[PDB]
Ligand binder design. Sequence first.
Ligand code: FMN
Length: 108
Amino acid sequence: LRHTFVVADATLPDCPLVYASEGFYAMTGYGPDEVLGHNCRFLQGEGTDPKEVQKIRDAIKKGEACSVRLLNYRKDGTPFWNLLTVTPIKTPDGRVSKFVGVQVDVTS
Ligand SMILES: *[C@@]12=NC3=[C]C([C])=C([C])[C]=C3N([C][C]([O])[C]([O])[C]([O])[C]OP([O])([O])=O)C1=NC(=O)[N]C2=O
């Protein structure tokens, strides 16, 4: 399964991405300069299902893992279907420190 992987910093209030695999930058068209420090939601656009988006929003607030199918757009504006799975990573005191995300392009 060809997949990409990113880390978001839950200690900052809008979960900015702090690490992305080589595949994430090659799949999306975006450089580190335009990804690090930003919330993953820039990948979204006109056809992205707000119902699915909201499922991720809620799981992140409730600190649960979650898995959704989103329509994302590359930097050149072409779309692709992104099967996204976000996992919360907690410290020993139960608090959420990072969210890790695996993304798979499932356009087949
Ligand atoms: C994105 N991947 C991704 C990876 C991680 C680890 C996290 C925490 C989130 C994402 N998102 C979603 C985005 O950050 C945000 O959570 C959602 O837009 C919903 O919340 P908001 O506040 O915006 O309503 C990813 N979103 C994508 O579209 N593509 C991914 O690869």
